[PDB]
């Protein structure tokens with residue numbers, strides 16, 4: 001407890017460039033021989049320095065090598081600071097280190113091999129840094145190690161075998177790195193392991209089948225790796241697993257039946273894999289919370305017992321080959337927040353019991369075979385924000401009560417057999433951002449009441465039996481629509497309202513395949529945000545407003561084909577930089593062809609076809625690799 005230690009900690013105060021909280025200030029005022037009473041510094045019963053605890057003190061600077069002088073040092077804490085530079089190789093001399101820390105900093109360089117000399121090191125904490133280079137095999141000498149937490153770094157190469165000798169390991173975290181190489185079966189040797197996080201790396205090879213050895217394991221995460229192979233049987237050995245996360249891997253073979261024993265499992269993420277086989281039983285005895293087995297090749301019905309674990313909050317079985325019906329048993333699990341049974345081959349009606357879910361937030365069951373009606377009980381899902389039911393065999397009238405869900409935000413009912421007219425009660429949902437009713441048998445004209453929902457960003461009403469005209473006040477209520485507008489493939493008549501000009505910020509506009517008659521309003525010169533415009537398959541007539549496309553510029557695709565468009569081709573098409581595909585086939589265009597469409601680099605597809613054009617056909621540009629069918633037939637063209 002003499003001079004050299006004080007010299008060492010004073011040497012440590014130096015190098016620490018900036019100290020905004022004034023922590024080391026306290027080490028100056030007190031005194032020299034009173035260092036044991038300094039902020040953070042605590043000594044033993046003999047006066048020697050054993051602990052340096054400076055956490056969240058916002059210290060910046062570099063870690064000083066003089067900390068190799070403090071021989072009696074057992075714990076070095078620097079949690080959540082700004083210590084840049086690297087780790088000193090002399091820090092292996094400390095032989096009294098018990099637990100060494102340096103979490104949440106800016107420590108670059110690679111981890112020194114000299115850390116293998118810390119014979120008393122029980123806890124090594126180096127995560128959330130810039131630590132590069134390979135994992136040092138010398139770390140396999142620290143035979144007292146329990147917690148090895150070096151995740152969230154830039155560490156590379158493969159896992160040294162030595163790490164599997166450290167038999168006292170309970171926590172192990174190598175996640176969030178650039179580690180490669182397989183996961184050796186030698187993990188079976190850390191029998192005292194309790195936490196294994198390997199997720200977010202570049203691990204390959206077969207899956208470590210001897211993971212069934214460590215029966216104290218409670219956390220197992222290996223998400224986002226190229227780990228292939230089958231999940232082991234007798235998985236029901238480890239009756240202490242609570243989190244099991246192997247998603248986004250190349251896992252094959254079925255979900256082991258022995259997983260029925262694991263009674264402590266709460267989290268199972270086996271998604272984005274090639275897993276096969278039917279789904280087992282036993283899930284009714286597990287008290288889980290998140291079951292995510294989507295994006296797999298799972299066959300067979302959805303197991304009834306899965307409906308007994310009334311604390312299940314997330315159920316995700318989508319993108320599978322799952323048959324069967326969504327039984328009414330779903331009425332039991334009332335803690336359920338998000339359900340994705342989409343992209344499957346489920347049959348049967350929607351059960352009324354679904355009105356018992358209460359706190360349900362996301363309801364996704366599209367791309368299946370759900371027949372029947374939408375129950376009125378689904379007005380009880382007040383917390384619901386997302387509803388998807390497209391690509392199904394759902395039919396009949398939309399229940400009135402289901403417009404009493406103020407909180408609902410997104411609705412996709414497209415591609416079904418809903419008949420009848422569009423209810424004005426759709427106004428009751430003044431909080432929709434997405435509305436797709438496309439692909440149906442919706443008849444009658446468009447309700448103007450829909451001017452209520454001013455928060456829309458995607459309005460898809462295409463492919464229907466929609467007659468009448470487009471209400472101007474409805475188009476006008478959508479001022480700041482951000483994305484998509486599709487009225488195409490209907491029986492809409494009349495003219496294109498001037499209120500379409502108020503629709504700025506909108507990217508895709510499609511009014512094709514209708515009975516529109518009037519010429520193209522100049523009103524819509526305001527929408528520069530438009531990427532794709534489609535007014536094809538209509539009875540439109542007139543000249544093409546140069547002045548309306550002069551201020552469109554951001555057009556990616558323009559389809560004005562099969563119309564009664566007369567006039568010349570606007571020169572404004574040359575100033576169109578982002579132009580890619582232009583279609584003006586089947587018109588009464590009597591122009592001479594602009595020389596500006598020639599020298600267009602971004603341009604690629606150009607359809608003129610059945611017109612009445614004259615003059616010399618251009619050369620340089622997209623006329624080099626042009627087809628003759630695109631020109632045939634313009635009556636007369638020299639070139």
Ligand SMILES: *[C@@H]1O[C@H](CO)[C@@H](O)[C@H](O)[C@H]1NC(C)=O
Nearest residue numbers: 168191192193194215216217
């Ligand atoms: C396994 O964990 C239990 C409970 O924490 C503990 O009593 C036991 O020591 C551990 N077994 C081994 C081999 O480490």
Ligand SMILES: *[C@@H]1O[C@H](CO)[C@@H](O)[C@H](O)[C@H]1NC(C)=O
Nearest residue numbers: 219221242243266267289290
């Ligand atoms: C383990 O699961 C629980 C929820 O079941 C969760 O709070 C926790 O983050 C998970 N642990 C990890 C990060 O593996």
Ligand SMILES: *[C@@H]1O[C@H](CO)[C@@H](O)[C@H](O)[C@H]1NC(C)=O
Nearest residue numbers: 265266286287288289311312
């Ligand atoms: C079942 O799991 C939930 C969440 O982990 C918890 O609230 C509940 O207490 C658990 N039941 C048991 C057996 O402790």
Ligand SMILES: *[C@@H]1O[C@H](CO)[C@@H](O)[C@H](O)[C@H]1NC(C)=O
Nearest residue numbers: 438462463486488489510534
């Ligand atoms: C608009 O909706 C129709 C409905 O059939 C669809 O087929 C079409 O591709 C959509 N338009 C565009 C270009 O996004």
Ligand SMILES: *[C@@H]1O[C@H](CO)[C@@H](O)[C@H](O)[C@H]1NC(C)=O
Nearest residue numbers: 512513536537559561562583
């Ligand atoms: C433009 O739309 C018309 C009529 O709807 C269609 O026949 C044609 O394929 C479309 N043009 C192109 C090539 O996008």
Ligand SMILES: [Zn+2]
Nearest residue numbers: 175197199221
């Ligand atoms: Zn993690």
Ligand SMILES: [Zn+2]
Nearest residue numbers: 199221223245
């Ligand atoms: Zn994960």
Ligand SMILES: [Zn+2]
Nearest residue numbers: 342343364366
């Ligand atoms: Zn989906």
Ligand SMILES: [Zn+2]
Nearest residue numbers: 543545546547
């Ligand atoms: Zn004019």
